[PDB]
Amino acid sequence: IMDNFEYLTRDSSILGPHHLDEFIRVWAEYDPAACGRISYNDMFEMLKHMSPPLGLGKKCPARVAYKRLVRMNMPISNEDMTVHFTSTLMALIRTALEIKLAPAGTKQHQCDAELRKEISVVWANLPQKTL
Amino acid sequence: ESARREVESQAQQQLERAKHKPVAFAVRTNVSYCGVLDEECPVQGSGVNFEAKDFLHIKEKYSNDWWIGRLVKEGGDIAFIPSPQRLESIRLKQEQKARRSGNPSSLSDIGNRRSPPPSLAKQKQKQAEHVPPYDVVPSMRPVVLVGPSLKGYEVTDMMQKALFDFLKHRFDGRISITRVTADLSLAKRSVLNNPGKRTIIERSSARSSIAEVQSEIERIFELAKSLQLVVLDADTINHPAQLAKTSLAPIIVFVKVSSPKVLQRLIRSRGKSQMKHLTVQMMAYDKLVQCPPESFDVILDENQLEDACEHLAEYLEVYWRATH
C-alpha cells in the first residue's frame, strides 16, 4: 500500500504521472517514426489534441500557454522545423508545480545546473531534450 | 624622559599594591569612549575599552583628571577612567575637529564673517538640561521583579514570593532582601537643590512623603555599597519604564506568562475576589507584554518554577563571579 501511497492520495488537479501515457497515445497519431525532428505546425493542434486540463483548461488559460511558447528562449535558434515535445511537456511539468523561473526569468542557468546535477548519471541523453 | 618612566613605574606599583583594597564606589557611563587610546592616561596600553552605559568600580584616587577602577566584567583588570572634568574636556575635543562649531558656517564663505566663538559655542550654554556624562549609580544593581500582573494581587504576589524565597535560600549568608513600603518611582536627581529640606516648613513638599522616597534612595545606595546582593520587594513597580530614567537602574526581572488565556485561567483558579480585578490585571499584563525585550535585563518565560529558578541563579552567579 505504501509503495503506491502517492497514487492512493492523488487529489487529481496537477496529475502528471498518469497523463504522460495519454500524451503518448495522442502523439502517436502524427509521428510515423523517430525521424529526429518534426515540423512546426503539428504542435499548435497538438496542444488541443491532448487533455485540456494540462495546459489550457478554458480559452483563458490558453493565454498562459501562449506565454509558454514565447517570452523566453525557445529552440527556434536551430532549424525552423524542430520538435517541441522536448520543450512543451517539460515546460508544463516544470511550471505546473514548484515554479520559480517565472518571477525572475533571468536565472535559467542555475535551475538548469540543478536539474542536471539531479540527473547527473543518465548517460547524457537528456542534453538534447533540455534545450 | 626619565620623569615619565618614573611616574609610569610609580603608577604600576600603586596599582599592584591597591589591587587588594576595598572598593570605594561605582559609576555608570553614557558615552562611547576608550581609555587606552588617549595620550593623557598615566599608564599607556592598560586603558579601559568601554562603551555606552557601562559600569565601573572605583577604589582609590589618582588626581582631578583620572581615577583608578575596574569593570564589572568577569576577570576585568584595573585601568584608569577619565575624570568628569577630563571627560568634559575630551568631549569638547570631540566637537572641535569639525570645520566649525559655532554660528559661522563654512559654506564657501571665508574671510568676511570671522565671528569669533561666542558663549553659545562653548560648554557654558546648553544648560537647559545639561545631562551629566557620569552618574553615581549604586555599586550593586538592585534586583526587581515585574509582572505578570499588578503587584498587590494574589497571582503576582505568589509568583514573586516563590522566587524571593528561592533567592533567599540559595544565596543564604550573601544576600539581603527587604520590602520597600515607600514609593520609588520618583528617584530624581535634578529637580532642585533640596525639595523639602525641613519637615517643619509646612510647605507642599514639606508635608508630603517625597523625603521618604529620597531617604529610601540613600538607603538603597548605602546597602549596595555593602557589596552584598540586594533584592527589592516594593509593590509600586509594574513597568520598567517607570524606573528607567532614575539613578538606580535596577536589574529588571520579568516573570512573563506565555498567553493571556493561561493567565486568566490562573486568575479564575483563585476565586471571585481576583475575578473582580481580572480586568485591570489583564490590562496591565498586556501593557507590560507590549514593552519590548530590550527594556528588560533578564526574562523568565519558562512555565516550570525550577527552570526559572536555576536561570536566575545562573545569571546572579555570573554577576557574583564577575564582580570579585
Add this chain to the structure above:
Amino acid sequence: WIFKAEEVMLAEEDRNFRRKEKMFRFFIRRMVKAQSFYWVV
C-alpha cells in the same frame, strides 16, 4: 508555581483551627505526588 509560593507564604507566616488543618492538607497534598506513593499504589 502558585502552590509552592503559597506553602512558602504559609510556612513563613506560621513560623513567626484553620492553620492546623491547612498545614495537614498541604502535607497530604505532597505525599500523593511523590514517587514513593506512585510505586506503593
Add this chain to the structure above:
Amino acid sequence: KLALQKAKEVAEVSPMSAANISIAARQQNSAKARSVWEQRASQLRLQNLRASCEA
C-alpha cells in the same frame, strides 16, 4: 530559543552557553524517522495551503 536568550542576556563575559546549544542541538535531530504517511501528510498540507492561497 532559551539558549539564545541565555547568551543574549550576558555580554559582560564570554558565554559558553552559545556553544552548549550547538553541541546539544544535533543529538535530538538524529531521530528524524518521518514515515511515508507523515511525508505525504506534509505534502498534502502544502498543496492545500497553496490552493487556499491561489483561491
